[PDB]
Amino acid sequence: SLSLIRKKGFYKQDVNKTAWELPKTYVSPTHVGSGAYGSVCSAIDKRSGEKVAIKKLSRPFQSEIFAKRAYRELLLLKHMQHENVIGLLDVFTPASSLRNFYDFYLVMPFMQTDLQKIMGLKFSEEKIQYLVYQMLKGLKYIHSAGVVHRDLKPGNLAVNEDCELKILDFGLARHVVTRWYRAPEVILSWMHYNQTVDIWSVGCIMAEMLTGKTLFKGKDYLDQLTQILKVTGVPGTEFVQKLNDKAAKSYIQSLPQTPRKDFTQLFPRASPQAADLLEKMLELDVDKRLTAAQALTHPFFEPFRDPEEETEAQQPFDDSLEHEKLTVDEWKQHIYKEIVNFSP
């Protein structure tokens, strides 16, 4: 039938030449940024005076790829409940029914910036301890739900002036590069992957926080990896045997063999505990590399460690449609049901 819900509950405003339609409680929408999949405004929840981030999905029903990604993102954001993992305060559409459903919005905690904006500056070790501790807590959590990031980089780590950290954009890897944060087994596919793909990235980010320099930077990854392995050395026959390719085998065999790792030449100014953690995270062998839960027990983190904060997901993340192909309309119908049944 006919209804006044929409006109009473929502207002329209142009922000960054894009039409936004928001519930009346969210005021003063201000452009923050844009990507391929959405755009973000900050707004004030007038009920409390608090700042939130609102993401308008960008034409999510233009293709199956976009619609499926929007679905999986919504599901992930709804499932995760951890302080170091970005989550949902609200989702809504202006539409009163499925018939009229074309647009939706995600409401999230506002974070002023991200680590990419700070890279190049040398961080004090206590700042590294606190920020990397938060990264690992967040990873422990998503990993416990069966979710991996797989594309962790400074741009994906939201931070504020108090060094609070949230992880963004996890679980969407299956849905141009000169600085390389992905695990070598992911970039070069030379070995089976596990959840410690994200621990390698933490290592690269921590290395960069320490020195001010990107660890792997240049046109060709393998050439940049070599520069480091020439200084650091590689693991032995137990590692080489796991390699899925004899050309990868020859590459590793041609590098210096070093029984015990020592990142002293690599990071001369790094404290002993920093260097030791770096060595255990920046580990080529995927079975030897620390998990998040293991890295959290490292003495590097003692000044900030609170085991109670190191939670796990109560339930595994469930996405039966992960490998499915549906039409745009079928993805839309699945998304709509998830918006309607949302509750904070």
Coordinates of C-alpha atoms in Angstrom, one line a residue:
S1 CA 0.0 0.0 0.0
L2 CA 0.9 3.7 0.3
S3 CA 3.1 4.9 3.2
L4 CA 4.8 7.9 4.6
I5 CA 7.6 6.0 6.4
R6 CA 10.3 7.0 3.9
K7 CA 9.4 10.7 3.6
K8 CA 9.1 11.1 7.4
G9 CA 12.2 9.1 8.3
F10 CA 14.8 10.1 5.7
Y11 CA 16.2 13.1 4.0
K12 CA 18.2 13.6 0.8
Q13 CA 21.5 15.4 0.4
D14 CA 24.2 15.7 -2.3
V15 CA 27.6 14.9 -1.0
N16 CA 30.6 14.8 -3.3
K17 CA 28.2 15.0 -6.4
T18 CA 26.5 11.8 -5.2
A19 CA 22.9 11.6 -3.9
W20 CA 22.7 10.4 -0.3
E21 CA 19.5 9.4 1.4
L22 CA 19.9 9.2 5.2
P23 CA 17.8 8.6 8.2
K24 CA 17.1 11.9 10.0
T25 CA 19.1 11.0 13.0
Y26 CA 22.3 11.1 11.0
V27 CA 23.2 14.7 10.4
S28 CA 26.0 16.9 8.8
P29 CA 27.2 14.2 6.3
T30 CA 30.8 15.0 5.3
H31 CA 32.8 13.4 2.5
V32 CA 35.7 11.3 3.7
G33 CA 36.7 9.1 0.8
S34 CA 35.9 6.8 -2.1
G35 CA 36.8 3.4 -3.5
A36 CA 35.5 1.2 -6.3
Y37 CA 32.8 -0.4 -4.1
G38 CA 31.5 2.5 -2.0
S39 CA 32.0 6.0 -0.6
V40 CA 32.2 7.1 2.9
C41 CA 30.9 10.1 4.8
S42 CA 31.2 11.0 8.4
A43 CA 28.0 12.0 10.1
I44 CA 26.8 12.8 13.6
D45 CA 24.3 10.6 15.3
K46 CA 22.1 13.5 16.7
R47 CA 20.8 11.1 19.5
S48 CA 24.2 11.1 21.2
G49 CA 26.3 13.7 19.4
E50 CA 28.8 11.0 18.4
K51 CA 30.6 10.7 15.0
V52 CA 30.0 7.7 12.8
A53 CA 31.2 6.6 9.4
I54 CA 28.6 5.8 6.8
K55 CA 29.4 3.9 3.6
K56 CA 27.1 4.2 0.7
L57 CA 27.6 1.1 -1.5
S58 CA 28.4 2.3 -5.1
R59 CA 25.9 0.7 -7.6
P60 CA 26.1 -2.7 -5.8
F61 CA 23.7 -4.2 -8.4
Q62 CA 25.6 -3.2 -11.6
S63 CA 27.0 -6.8 -11.9
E64 CA 27.0 -10.2 -10.1
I65 CA 30.6 -9.5 -8.9
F66 CA 29.6 -6.3 -7.2
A67 CA 26.4 -7.7 -5.8
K68 CA 28.1 -10.9 -4.4
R69 CA 30.9 -8.8 -2.8
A70 CA 28.3 -6.5 -1.2
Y71 CA 26.5 -9.6 0.2
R72 CA 29.7 -11.1 1.6
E73 CA 30.9 -7.9 3.1
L74 CA 27.6 -7.4 4.9
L75 CA 27.7 -10.9 6.3
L76 CA 31.2 -10.5 7.6
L77 CA 30.6 -7.1 9.2
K78 CA 27.4 -8.5 10.9
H79 CA 29.3 -11.5 12.2
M80 CA 32.4 -10.0 13.8
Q81 CA 32.3 -8.5 17.4
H82 CA 35.7 -7.4 18.4
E83 CA 37.2 -4.0 19.2
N84 CA 40.0 -4.3 16.7
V85 CA 37.8 -5.5 13.9
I86 CA 35.6 -3.1 12.1
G87 CA 31.9 -3.9 12.7
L88 CA 28.4 -2.7 12.0
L89 CA 26.5 -0.2 14.1
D90 CA 23.6 -0.2 11.6
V91 CA 22.6 -1.1 8.0
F92 CA 19.7 0.4 6.2
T93 CA 18.1 1.1 2.9
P94 CA 15.7 4.0 2.2
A95 CA 13.5 1.5 0.2
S96 CA 10.3 0.4 2.0
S97 CA 10.3 -3.0 0.2
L98 CA 12.3 -5.4 -2.0
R99 CA 10.5 -4.2 -5.0
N100 CA 12.1 -0.8 -4.5
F101 CA 15.5 -1.9 -3.2
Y102 CA 18.4 -0.3 -5.0
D103 CA 20.7 1.3 -2.5
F104 CA 22.1 0.6 1.0
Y105 CA 24.3 2.0 3.7
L106 CA 26.6 0.6 6.3
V107 CA 27.1 2.5 9.5
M108 CA 30.4 1.9 11.3
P109 CA 32.6 3.4 14.1
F110 CA 34.4 6.4 12.8
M111 CA 38.2 6.2 12.6
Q112 CA 40.1 9.3 11.7
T113 CA 42.7 7.8 9.4
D114 CA 44.7 4.7 8.5
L115 CA 48.3 3.6 8.9
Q116 CA 49.1 4.2 5.2
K117 CA 48.9 8.0 6.0
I118 CA 51.6 7.6 8.6
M119 CA 54.1 5.3 6.8
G120 CA 57.5 6.8 6.2
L121 CA 57.7 8.0 9.8
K122 CA 59.7 6.1 12.4
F123 CA 57.5 4.8 15.2
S124 CA 58.8 4.5 18.8
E125 CA 58.8 0.9 19.9
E126 CA 56.0 1.4 22.5
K127 CA 53.7 2.7 19.7
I128 CA 54.7 -0.4 17.6
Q129 CA 54.1 -2.7 20.6
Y130 CA 50.6 -1.2 21.1
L131 CA 49.6 -1.1 17.4
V132 CA 50.9 -4.5 16.5
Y133 CA 49.3 -6.0 19.6
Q134 CA 45.9 -4.7 18.4
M135 CA 46.5 -6.0 14.9
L136 CA 47.2 -9.5 16.3
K137 CA 44.2 -9.4 18.6
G138 CA 42.0 -8.6 15.6
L139 CA 43.6 -11.3 13.5
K140 CA 43.4 -13.9 16.3
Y141 CA 39.7 -13.1 16.4
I142 CA 38.9 -13.3 12.6
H143 CA 41.1 -16.4 12.3
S144 CA 39.2 -18.1 15.1
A145 CA 36.0 -17.6 13.0
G146 CA 37.6 -19.2 10.0
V147 CA 38.3 -15.9 8.2
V148 CA 41.6 -14.7 6.8
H149 CA 42.4 -11.2 5.5
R150 CA 44.9 -12.2 2.8
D151 CA 45.5 -8.6 1.7
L152 CA 46.5 -6.9 4.9
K153 CA 48.3 -3.6 4.3
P154 CA 48.7 -0.2 6.0
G155 CA 45.6 1.1 4.1
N156 CA 43.5 -1.6 5.7
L157 CA 44.4 -0.6 9.3
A158 CA 42.2 2.2 10.5
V159 CA 43.7 4.2 13.4
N160 CA 42.9 7.3 15.5
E161 CA 45.1 9.8 17.4
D162 CA 44.9 7.6 20.5
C163 CA 46.5 4.7 18.6
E164 CA 43.3 2.6 18.6
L165 CA 43.3 0.3 15.7
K166 CA 40.7 -1.5 13.6
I167 CA 41.2 -4.0 10.8
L168 CA 39.2 -3.2 7.6
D169 CA 38.5 -5.2 4.4
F170 CA 39.1 -8.8 5.7
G171 CA 37.6 -12.0 4.2
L172 CA 37.2 -10.4 0.7
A173 CA 40.4 -11.4 -1.1
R174 CA 38.5 -13.8 -3.4
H175 CA 36.3 -11.0 -4.7
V176 CA 49.2 -1.7 -9.6
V177 CA 51.3 -3.0 -6.8
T178 CA 54.7 -1.5 -5.9
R179 CA 54.8 -2.1 -2.2
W180 CA 54.3 -5.7 -1.2
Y181 CA 52.6 -6.8 2.0
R182 CA 51.1 -10.1 0.9
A183 CA 52.8 -13.4 2.0
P184 CA 55.4 -14.8 -0.5
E185 CA 53.4 -18.0 -0.8
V186 CA 50.4 -15.9 -1.9
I187 CA 52.3 -13.7 -4.4
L188 CA 54.4 -16.6 -5.8
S189 CA 52.0 -19.5 -5.1
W190 CA 55.0 -21.7 -4.4
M191 CA 53.4 -23.5 -1.3
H192 CA 50.2 -24.3 0.5
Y193 CA 48.8 -21.3 2.4
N194 CA 47.3 -21.2 5.9
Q195 CA 46.1 -18.4 8.2
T196 CA 49.6 -17.2 8.9
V197 CA 49.5 -15.5 5.5
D198 CA 48.4 -12.5 7.6
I199 CA 51.3 -12.8 10.1
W200 CA 53.8 -12.2 7.2
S201 CA 51.9 -8.9 6.5
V202 CA 52.0 -7.8 10.1
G203 CA 55.8 -8.4 9.9
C204 CA 56.2 -6.2 6.8
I205 CA 54.1 -3.5 8.4
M206 CA 56.0 -3.7 11.7
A207 CA 59.3 -3.6 9.8
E208 CA 58.1 -0.4 8.1
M209 CA 57.0 1.2 11.4
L210 CA 60.5 0.5 12.8
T211 CA 62.7 1.8 10.0
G212 CA 60.4 4.1 8.1
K213 CA 61.1 2.1 4.9
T214 CA 58.9 -0.3 3.0
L215 CA 60.4 -3.8 3.3
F216 CA 59.4 -5.0 -0.2
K217 CA 59.3 -2.0 -2.7
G218 CA 59.8 -2.1 -6.4
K219 CA 58.5 -3.2 -9.7
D220 CA 59.2 -7.0 -9.4
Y221 CA 58.4 -8.9 -6.2
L222 CA 60.9 -11.7 -6.6
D223 CA 63.8 -9.2 -7.1
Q224 CA 62.8 -7.4 -3.9
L225 CA 62.5 -10.7 -2.0
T226 CA 65.9 -11.7 -3.2
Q227 CA 67.5 -8.5 -1.8
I228 CA 66.2 -9.4 1.6
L229 CA 67.0 -13.2 1.4
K230 CA 70.6 -12.4 0.4
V231 CA 71.0 -10.7 3.7
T232 CA 68.9 -13.0 5.8
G233 CA 69.4 -16.5 4.3
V234 CA 66.8 -19.2 3.8
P235 CA 65.6 -22.4 5.5
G236 CA 66.9 -25.8 4.5
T237 CA 65.7 -29.1 3.0
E238 CA 62.5 -29.5 5.1
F239 CA 61.3 -26.2 3.6
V240 CA 62.5 -26.9 0.0
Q241 CA 60.7 -30.2 0.0
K242 CA 57.4 -28.4 0.6
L243 CA 57.8 -26.2 -2.5
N244 CA 55.4 -27.1 -5.2
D245 CA 57.8 -26.2 -8.0
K246 CA 61.4 -27.2 -8.9
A247 CA 62.1 -23.6 -10.2
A248 CA 61.1 -22.3 -6.7
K249 CA 63.4 -25.1 -5.3
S250 CA 66.4 -23.9 -7.4
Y251 CA 65.7 -20.3 -6.4
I252 CA 65.8 -21.1 -2.7
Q253 CA 68.9 -23.4 -3.0
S254 CA 70.8 -20.6 -4.8
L255 CA 70.4 -18.3 -1.7
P256 CA 72.7 -18.4 1.4
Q257 CA 71.8 -21.1 3.9
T258 CA 71.6 -19.9 7.5
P259 CA 70.9 -22.4 10.3
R260 CA 69.9 -19.7 12.8
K261 CA 68.2 -16.5 11.7
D262 CA 69.6 -13.2 12.8
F263 CA 67.8 -10.0 11.7
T264 CA 70.7 -7.9 13.2
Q265 CA 72.1 -6.8 9.8
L266 CA 68.5 -6.2 8.5
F267 CA 67.3 -4.2 11.4
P268 CA 70.3 -2.8 13.3
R269 CA 68.3 -0.5 15.6
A270 CA 65.6 -2.9 16.4
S271 CA 65.5 -4.0 20.1
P272 CA 66.3 -7.7 20.8
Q273 CA 62.6 -8.5 21.4
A274 CA 61.5 -6.6 18.3
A275 CA 64.1 -8.4 16.1
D276 CA 63.2 -11.8 17.6
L277 CA 59.4 -11.2 16.9
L278 CA 60.2 -10.0 13.3
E279 CA 62.3 -13.2 12.7
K280 CA 59.4 -15.4 13.7
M281 CA 56.7 -13.5 11.7
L282 CA 58.9 -13.0 8.6
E283 CA 59.4 -16.7 8.2
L284 CA 59.3 -18.3 4.8
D285 CA 58.1 -21.7 6.1
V286 CA 54.3 -21.5 6.5
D287 CA 54.3 -24.3 9.1
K288 CA 57.0 -22.5 11.2
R289 CA 55.6 -19.0 11.0
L290 CA 53.8 -17.8 14.2
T291 CA 50.0 -17.9 14.4
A292 CA 48.3 -14.7 15.8
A293 CA 47.6 -16.5 19.2
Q294 CA 51.3 -17.5 19.4
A295 CA 52.6 -14.0 18.5
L296 CA 50.4 -12.5 21.2
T297 CA 52.4 -14.4 23.8
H298 CA 55.7 -12.9 22.7
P299 CA 57.6 -10.8 25.4
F300 CA 57.6 -7.8 23.0
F301 CA 54.0 -7.2 24.0
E302 CA 54.4 -7.5 27.8
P303 CA 53.8 -3.7 28.6
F304 CA 50.3 -3.9 26.9
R305 CA 49.2 -7.6 27.1
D306 CA 45.8 -8.3 28.7
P307 CA 44.9 -11.9 28.0
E308 CA 41.2 -11.1 28.7
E309 CA 41.1 -8.8 25.6
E310 CA 42.4 -11.7 23.4
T311 CA 38.9 -13.1 22.5
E312 CA 37.8 -15.7 20.0
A313 CA 34.6 -15.8 17.9
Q314 CA 31.8 -17.6 19.7
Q315 CA 30.7 -19.2 16.4
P316 CA 32.4 -19.9 13.0
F317 CA 31.7 -17.6 10.1
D318 CA 29.0 -19.2 8.0
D319 CA 28.8 -18.4 4.3
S320 CA 27.2 -21.2 2.3
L321 CA 27.0 -19.0 -0.8
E322 CA 30.8 -18.3 -0.9
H323 CA 31.4 -20.4 -4.0
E324 CA 27.9 -19.9 -5.6
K325 CA 26.9 -18.1 -8.8
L326 CA 23.5 -16.3 -8.6
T327 CA 22.0 -13.6 -10.7
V328 CA 22.1 -9.9 -9.5
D329 CA 18.5 -10.2 -8.5
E330 CA 19.2 -13.4 -6.4
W331 CA 22.1 -11.7 -4.6
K332 CA 19.8 -8.6 -4.0
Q333 CA 17.1 -10.8 -2.5
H334 CA 19.7 -12.4 -0.1
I335 CA 21.1 -9.0 0.8
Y336 CA 17.6 -7.6 1.5
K337 CA 16.8 -10.4 3.9
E338 CA 20.0 -9.7 5.8
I339 CA 19.3 -6.0 6.1
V340 CA 15.7 -6.5 7.4
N341 CA 16.8 -9.1 10.0
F342 CA 19.7 -6.9 11.4
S343 CA 19.7 -6.1 15.0
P344 CA 22.5 -4.4 17.0

